[PDB]
DNA sequence: CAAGCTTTTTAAGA
DNA sequence: AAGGCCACTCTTAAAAAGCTTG
RNA sequence: AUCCGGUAACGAAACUACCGGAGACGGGUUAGGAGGUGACGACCUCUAAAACCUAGAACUUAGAGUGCAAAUACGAGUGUAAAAGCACUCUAAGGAGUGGCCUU
């Protein structure tokens, strides 16, 4: 793709006349999608328990756009089947709507009322992306995580039968690879004979019921197995968060959310005065007609049509008058090899606090359509990634680590947890959220169990949504974006300064080799003149300043800097098994004590040299 | 009771 | 609660329900 | 209550201790720096900040500039006369997010 974003704050971009609508739209969109996703998930379970396994001439259920859209209509209180016209295929849609509506009645333990969920926002286009994004989540989850279900039912079966844990993984690993070329898998789909991996991409819906079946077995069938080995997966994703999610607003979405006939006529009057061309727009329905109908003639180029959207954005928003216009007015960054010129793409993603402007190359702007020797001179460093010590970088004589605690302090994790708990406690949800919803597992695939979670939440949905609608939760989301870059960038500057100057001490370290000693003395004045040797495994934001290379990680944690043999082992003989403390097993060592980061980082640098 | 107009929302579109 | 991966980045003609006029 | 660095123990660890700095999301209010006599301290004034309250702004990394806050000695013994930190501009280096899932 050729799309980039400029994430900033939403203040001032939307006029005060429409700021209330945008924030309310975000709340409404989250409520509709969050409830609709649960209804869709429950509806799928209804089908699974009522029609799985299928008959010889029955089709495996495939979710589409209209399934989720109907769920949104049901959540909004719509009882009339939202189907256009009468026909064979349209008849199927009407029947599907009735099935979902009946399930909605069963899901909640009281009679639905129409005038308890009514809304006055035209979120039809805004909700479309959440429908597509949710639908894509189902496909992504099936394709990228189905193998995990395969490697878990077999593992649980082996454990349930008393076999050793080590052998269970052996059987599961071999079985999964073999099936790439026993009832957990569907019949081979591709008639061309390609491996099963191609079939998974060809049709994800066929494999979706298989995951649901596996989850049911984990909850009840494998009772004897320890719970730690039966962590439930989520075959059917749904929006479980209560903090409002970011909505996507396009030219069509913005056009119908913040316009009326009185305002629409103003746009025509303003457009006529500035451009002198009358627009063939009669009402809010014909507003989004094609360029040919609006002007009566085809645009000279796609750019001309795109510019029409930009002008409409200007009338509805402060795109050309707000602070953020500095970064959107054809800004060309200094060091782009191609000299790309970036301009607003007529698309914005926002949640009422943070705003994400879409910016694309000027050449491609318009309406869219459906579809080696540097090692000698550079200074070399070794790096060993992790998850507690995120990065451990050493020059062979000294080491610096980017500990997870450093990022937490930079991102103010303790305060964010402190503030979030206080708001939850203040609203009285602490005695309910931690006590009730924690027991009923939301991942449960049993309709009875999942229904209990759904209705239990519904009794406190109003309180829960309002508590998390506070801007503090969304403001923290921007802080982590802001401070996370600061923490990483700040460490990058430290990396240069530490190794920028020749080492002033060369005696305290003993085991350093001659080649490594020479490297440490090099003087470097630029970020790009330092090469860091990374492992096979944050690096994306390090390559912008520091050149990088890959070093094998084979036995890096066992080999000793002092010896060709792996004489290192975890510390022993002390009251507590200290986490990363390492000690040699023999006296033939220039150094006895070692740390995992120092020892691991040293080996990576040594292999590079 | 008849007709015009507006506005959500559908639905195809590779 | 936090780090990694995968997918996506949507435009337009119209059906039908609701409202106004006498 | 957390991060970095150093001291010892033949490159040292969230129960080994000691030594020196950092910092506390955005807004209301506390205690600390600075000034009538660039004396002390009594009061007054600029600044600023956590306990508590709160629907709430902000792309990031190093530096360089500008601009701060105002009212002891004579005489024919005795009177009286720049710091913490805040904001703006630069150079040069970066500069795509949303949603779901997995894992701990
Ligand atoms: Zn050794």
TrEMBL record:
Disulfide bond positions: 511-590
Keyword annotations of the record: Metal-binding, Zinc
Top-level taxon of origin: Eukaryota
Binding site for Zn(2+): 560, 563, 567, 589
Descriptive protein name: Uncharacterized protein
Organism: Guillardia theta (strain CCMP2712) (Cryptophyte)
Classification of source organism: Eukaryota, Cryptophyceae, Pyrenomonadales, Geminigeraceae, Guillardia
């Amino acid at each position: 793709s050729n799309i980039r974003i400029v994430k900033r704050k939403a203040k001032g971009f939307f006029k005060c006349e429409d700021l209330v609508t945008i924030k309310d739209a975000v709340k409404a969109a989250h409520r509709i999608m969050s409830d609709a996703s649960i209804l869709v998930r429950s509806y799928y379970l209804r089908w699974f328990q009522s029609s799985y396994p299928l008959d010889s001439d029955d089709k495996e259920l495939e979710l589409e756009h209209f399934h989720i859209s109907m769920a949104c209509s049901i959540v909004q209180g719509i009882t009339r089947p939202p189907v256009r016209g009468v026909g064979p295929e349209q008849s199927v849609k009407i029947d599907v709507f009735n099935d979902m509506l009946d399930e909605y009645k069963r899901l909640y333990e009281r009679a639905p009322n129409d005038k308890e969920n009514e809304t006055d926002l035209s979120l039809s286009h805004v909700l479309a992306y959440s429908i597509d994004n949710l639908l894509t989540a189902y496909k992504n989850n099936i394709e990228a995580h189905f193998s995990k279900y395969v490697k878990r039912f077999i593992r649980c079966d082996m454990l349930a039968k008393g076999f050793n844990k080590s052998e269970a993984n052996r059987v599961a690993a071999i079985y999964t690879n073999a099936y790439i070329y026993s009832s957990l898998f569907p019949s081979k789909i591709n008639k061309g004979g390609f491996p099963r991996v191609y079939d998974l991409k060809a049709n994800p819906w066929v494999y979706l019921p298989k995951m649901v079946m596996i989850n049911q077995a984990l909850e009840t069938d494998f009772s004897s197995v320890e719970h730690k080995e039966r962590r439930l997966l989520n075959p059917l994703p749904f929006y479980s968060s209560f903090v409002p999610m970011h909505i996507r607003i396009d030219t069509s979405g913005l056009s119908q959310l913040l316009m009326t006939k009185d305002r629409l006529d103003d746009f025509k009057r303003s457009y006529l005065a500035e451009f002198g061309v009358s627009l063939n727009i009669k009402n809010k329905g014909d507003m989004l007609a094609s360029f040919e109908k609006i002007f009566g003639r085809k645009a000279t180029s796609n750019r001309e049509a795109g510019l029409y959207a930009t002008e409409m954005w200007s009338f509805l928003t402060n795109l050309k008058t707000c602070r953020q216009w500095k970064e959107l007015d054809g800004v060309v960054r200094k060091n782009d090899p191609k000299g790309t010129q970036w301009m607003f793409d007529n698309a914005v993603v926002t949640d009422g606090v943070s705003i994400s402007f879409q910016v694309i190359d000027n050449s491609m702007f318009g309406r869219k359509a459906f579809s080696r020797e540097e090692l000698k001179t550079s200074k070399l460093l070794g790096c060993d990634p992790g998850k507690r010590d995120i990065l451990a970088i050493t020059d062979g004589i000294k080491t610096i680590c980017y500990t997870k605690g450093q990022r937490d302090m930079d991102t103010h994790k303790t305060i964010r947890l402190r503030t979030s708990l206080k708001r939850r406690r203040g609203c009285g949800l602490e005695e309910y959220e931690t006590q009730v919803m924690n027991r009923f597992q939301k991942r449960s695939c049993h309709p009875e169990m999942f229904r209990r979670y759904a209705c239990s939440r519904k009794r406190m949905e109003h309180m829960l949504l309002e508590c998390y609608s506070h801007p503090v939760f969304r403001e923290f989301k921007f802080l982590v974006y802001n401070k996370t870059k600061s923490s990483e960038h700040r460490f990058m500057h430290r990396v240069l300064e530490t190794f920028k100057r020749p080492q002033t001490n060369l005696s305290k370290a003993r085991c350093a080799s001659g080649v490594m000693r020479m490297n440490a003395l090099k003087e470097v004045q630029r970020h790009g003149d330092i090469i860091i040797g990374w492992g096979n495994w944050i690096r994306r934001r390090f390559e912008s300043l520091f050149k990088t290379t890959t070093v094998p990680e084979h036995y890096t944690s066992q080999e000793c800097p002092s010896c060709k043999g792996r004489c290192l082992r975890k510390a022993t003989g002390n009251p507590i098994m200290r986490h990363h403390l390492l000690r040699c097993t023999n006296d033939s060592c220039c150094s006895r004590w070692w740390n995992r980061n120092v020892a691991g980082a040293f080996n990576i640098l040594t292999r590079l040299l």
